[PDB]
Write a protein that binds this ligand. Structure first.
Ligand code: NAG
Lengths: 98, 596
């Protein structure tokens, strides 16, 4: 029937900073006429709700996006990838990395 | 302060809601078309009423901008598209009267009911029946009686309605910065932007008749041949000096002469190219028909249709009590949703209809990137033209043999080519003079030059002079003959049905030059021609964002509106008719009538 639970900002006075989030619902003032928090002659809502539906075509359907940012601040490292180990052998001159 | 910067914000705010609301309305309409039922009626009601009652505010607020300073051409065009107030320029009572009169004329025209005087218990409708009796029969008395009946019991009540409709519409146009209704009809066909591509309303006015004289001999040869065939069939019913009557054409209003091809067939010995046997024998269902039709589209260069169209859209067999409309339509629901609405059968006619629908889908998806107000063709004569070009290029025997739909050992010769050319001409050129005269009469009656009383006589005399159709029976002034037509009580501009064919062959001609094909234009094919697809798509993707005068430049190199390829198409027919009407004069005198 139409999902409108996902919204996106359409208008803002200034662009977003790298890794910046704006959640304010302040009424945008497109023109020079200020508004007291209501729509008016030149005021529109910055946020718009998508209308995602299963009948929507390619390029309009919702897509779940996750961005993984890796930080290596001077603090000691905490997260590192797995390390695999082989099988041990005995009574044979070999080299090892215990 | 600013007026062009906030215009962008207003346009975005309007478009964001307009797109989804139009999607909802189209979805409801499609659902009711698939589900013809009471439950889906309120769906379209609550979709359309909401769409109108929401677009009314968008139209209302789209006047606070003084549209004489916006530098951006696209923004200016978008804002002008909404700056129009529609029919809201008159008083409330005047608007209500106009709505009531349009409603009553639309209801009246769709209520054809005439009985035979001898048996007043059997009336007939415009449905098959009354139309079928006079369209497929060899008679002169009953066909003329039916022609009178549809034009007498229905043709008398349309005159008082049309008389007030014309004056009210002209008054609305005068209040709407238009001298008459004709220029409002041509308001869309007027671009005043970039230099060298400016188009005025009067340009088409004075160019339609400018290029009309060239097609006169082509129509006259066919008219003379048909009249000679009528001598061969109807004993002394038509004067060779004059011309044939109206109802004997085969159609109620003489639009098409295809139904008269049976009585005017030169060589009926050779059967017409029909692949119904080929498709039935080789087990070609509707899905196979669509699959084989899209092969030509993908070979030309048009992108293949995306997934979802084949699923959501209905294709064939409405089947059970759940009925569906069988009108071939192309649906662009928005958000990347395209659908078809067809009742496909195993028929070459349905083959060409499917090709037309695929062309419509391709052109509709061509301008997808355009904004909501610009997701349309450059003018009104491009969608149907593109749809019919594919049908023209698919009916060629060469393509049918290429797709393995014809016998590879065919022995096609000039006789069958001439027969096919004559049959195609009887459908194409048989309506162009009628279209021209109807549009000219509508332009003149909406211009107010002809008074209220001087309506029928001028129409009849100019039909006799231009088309060459005489009155089988006398008619009085109270008859409103042009009103008894589909696109006269529905407020439809009819000039659009004229230029597109003239575009078609041009495109075809260009496609012919973009085909590397040597031979006749009717056998000219763009199969396996990628350049033909790329050149077309370069303009198709533009949509209505660009002027149509500029749009008609990437396919045909001439901006001038001249009928070059129509005569080139019917050249074998013209040279055969020159050898046909050797002892029979071509033309008519407006002095002979069946009644006098
Ligand atoms: C069509 O409408 C009827 C009600 O008239 C309803 O029962 C049926 O479920 C509908 N079918 C679809 C496919 O929506």
């Amino acid at each position: 029937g139409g999902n409108y639970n996902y919204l996106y900002r359409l208008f803002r006075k200034s662009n977003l900073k790298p890794f910046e989030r704006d959640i304010s619902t302040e009424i945008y003032q497109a023109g020079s006429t200020p508004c007291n928090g209501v729509k008016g002659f030149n005021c529109y809502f910055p946020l718009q709700s998508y209308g995602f539906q299963p009948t929507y075509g390619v390029g309009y359907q919702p897509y779940r996006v996750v961005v993984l940012s890796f930080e290596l601040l001077h603090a000691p490292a905490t997260v590192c990838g797995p390390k695999k180990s082989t099988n041990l052998v005995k009574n044979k001159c070999v080299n090892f990395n215990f | 302060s600013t007026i062009e910067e906030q215009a962008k914000t207003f346009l975005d705010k309007f478009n964001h809601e307009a797109e989804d609301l139009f999607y909802q309305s189209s979805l409801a309409s499609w659902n009711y078309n698939t589900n013809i039922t009471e439950e889906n009626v309120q769906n379209m009601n609550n979709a359309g009423d909401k769409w109108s009652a929401f677009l009314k505010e968008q139209s209302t607020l789209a006047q606070m901008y003084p549209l004489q300073e916006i530098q951006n051409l696209t923004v200016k065009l978008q804002l002008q598209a909404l700056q129009q107030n529609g029919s809201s320029v008159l008083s409330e009572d005047k608007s209500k009267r106009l709505n009531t009169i349009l409603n009553t004329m639309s209801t009246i025209y769709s209520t054809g009911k005439v009985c035979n005087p001898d048996n007043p218990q059997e009336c007939l409708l415009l449905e098959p029946g009354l139309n079928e009796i006079m369209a497929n029969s060899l008679d002169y008395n009953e066909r003329l009686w039916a022609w009178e009946s549809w034009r007498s019991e229905v043709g008398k009540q349309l005159r008082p309605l049309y008389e007030e409709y014309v004056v009210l519409k002209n008054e609305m146009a005068r209040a709407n910065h238009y001298e008459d209704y004709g220029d409002y009809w041509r308001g869309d066909y007027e671009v005043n932007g970039v230099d060298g591509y400016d188009y005025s309303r009067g340009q088409l006015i004075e160019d339609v008749e400018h290029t009309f004289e060239e097609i006169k001999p082509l129509y006259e040869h066919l008219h003379a041949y048909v009249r000679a065939k009528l001598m061969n069939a109807y004993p002394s019913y038509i004067s060779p000096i004059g011309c044939l009557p109206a109802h004997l054409l085969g159609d109620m209003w003489g639009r098409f002469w295809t139904n008269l091809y049976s009585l005017t067939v030169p060589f009926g010995q050779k059967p017409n190219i029909d692949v119904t046997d080929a498709m039935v024998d080789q087990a070609w269902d509707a899905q196979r028909i669509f699959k084989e039709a899209e092969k030509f589209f993908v070979s030309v260069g048009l992108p293949n249709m995306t997934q979802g169209f084949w699923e959501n859209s209905m294709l064939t067999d409405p089947g059970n009590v759940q009925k569906a409309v069988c009108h071939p339509t192309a649906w662009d629901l928005g958000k990347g949703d395209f659908r078809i609405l067809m009742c496909t059968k195993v028929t070459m006619d349905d083959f060409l209809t499917a090709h037309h629908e695929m062309g419509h889908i391709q052109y509709d998806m061509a301008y997808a990137a355009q904004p909501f107000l610009l997701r349309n063709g450059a003018n009104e004569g491009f969608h149907e033209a593109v749809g019919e070009i594919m049908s023209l290029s698919a009916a060629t025997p060469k393509h049918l043999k290429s797709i393995g739909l014809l016998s590879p050992d065919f022995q096609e010769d000039n006789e069958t080519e001439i027969n096919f050319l004559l049959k195609q001409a009887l459908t194409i050129v048989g309506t162009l003079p009628f279209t021209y005269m109807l549009e000219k009469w509508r332009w003149m009656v909406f211009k107010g030059e002809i008074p209220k009383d001087q309506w029928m006589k001028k129409w009849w005399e100019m039909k006799r002079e231009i088309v060459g159709v005489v009155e089988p029976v006398p008619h009085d002034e109270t008859y409103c003959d042009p009103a008894s037509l589909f696109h006269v009580s529905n407020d439809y501009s009819f000039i659009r049905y004229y230029t597109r064919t003239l575009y078609q062959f041009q495109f075809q001609e260009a496609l012919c030059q973009a085909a590397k094909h040597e031979g006749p234009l009717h056998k000219c094919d763009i199969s396996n021609s990628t350049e033909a697809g790329q050149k077309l798509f370069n303009m198709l993707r533009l949509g209505k964002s660009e002027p149509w005068t500029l749009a008609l430049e990437n396919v045909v190199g001439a901006k001038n509106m001249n009928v070059r390829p129509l005569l080139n198409y019917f050249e074998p027919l013209f040279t055969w008719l020159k050898d046909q009407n050797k002892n029979s004069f071509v033309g008519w005198s407006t002095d002979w009538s069946p009644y006098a």
